[PDB]
Amino acid sequence: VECDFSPLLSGTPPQVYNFKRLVFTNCNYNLTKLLSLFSVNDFTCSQISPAAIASNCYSSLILDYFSYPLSMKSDLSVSSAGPISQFNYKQSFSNPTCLILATVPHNLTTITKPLKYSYINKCSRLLSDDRTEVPQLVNANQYSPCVSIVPSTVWEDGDYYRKQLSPLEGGGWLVASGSTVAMTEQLQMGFGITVQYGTDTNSVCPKL
Numbered sequence: 352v353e354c355d356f357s358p359l360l361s362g363t364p365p366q367v368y369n370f371k372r373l374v375f376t377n378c379n380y381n382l383t384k385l386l387s388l389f390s391v392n393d394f395t396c397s398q399i400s401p402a403a404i405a406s407n408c409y410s411s412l413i414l415d416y417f418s419y420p421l422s423m424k425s426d427l428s429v430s431s432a433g434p435i436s437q438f439n440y441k442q443s444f445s446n447p448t449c450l451i452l453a454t455v456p457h458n459l460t461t462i463t464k465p466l467k468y469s470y471i472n473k474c475s476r477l478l479s480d481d482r483t484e485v486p487q488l489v490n491a492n493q494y495s496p497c498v499s500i501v502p503s504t505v506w507e508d509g510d511y512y513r514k515q516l517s518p519l520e521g522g523g524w525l526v527a528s529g530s531t532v533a534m535t536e537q538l539q540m541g542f543g544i545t546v547q548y549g550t551d552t553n554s555v556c557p558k559l
């Protein structure tokens with residue numbers, strides 16, 4: 352009983368390409384309890400609504416969280432190119448999702464700020480001909496192929512990262528570049544919620 356959103360409130364939220372995932376089964380949630388702590392700037396859903404998501408019974412609820420600057424709001428949509436959706440973070444297009452952009456108030460103190468926001472501006476793979484570059488896109492619910500070579504913080508805007516690939520990996524080179532955005536007065540964050548419905552497995556219910 353009782354879903355635990357605590358880990359979200361303790362410490363420094365990772366950068367978008369290192370999003371932390373909290374998984375819930377068999378428990379009871381109060382979503383509007385959690386959002387009461389933040390100033391909520393944006394809240395959009397897919398195949399569900401902000402009202403419905405705060406009040407439905409699911410077989411599973413997944414909550415991704417990460418530091419994210421409000422200024423890159425538009426880059427979250429799969430429409431566009433956008434480094435974010437292509438190389439950093441992508442929600443399921445099959446299951447009902449929600450995305451929330453929130454600022455953390457001064458009076459919320461247990462959440463510490465990083466030096467800046469970092470993201471991956473490019474993730475690509477150079478073929479054997481040493482000419483052709485093939486983008487390495489992030490899949491839903493997965494991390495970037497490049498998370499192994501990109502550090503948790505981008506040191507300097509424009510930094511490049513390369514890895515030589517073994518023949519088991521198909522050969523060639525993995526190439527990534529990182530970008531930075533300056534930290535804001537109050538930290539800004541993103542929350543990705545994904546829900547699933549079952550037949551009898553709908554044990555994630557709002558508390559009454």
Ligand SMILES: *[C@@H]1O[C@H](CO)[C@@H](O)[C@H](O)[C@H]1NC(C)=O
Nearest residue numbers: 381382383384385387558559
């Ligand atoms: C859930 O939390 C919100 C926080 O604003 C509160 O208003 C509401 O009464 C709570 N609901 C239940 C059933 O605890």
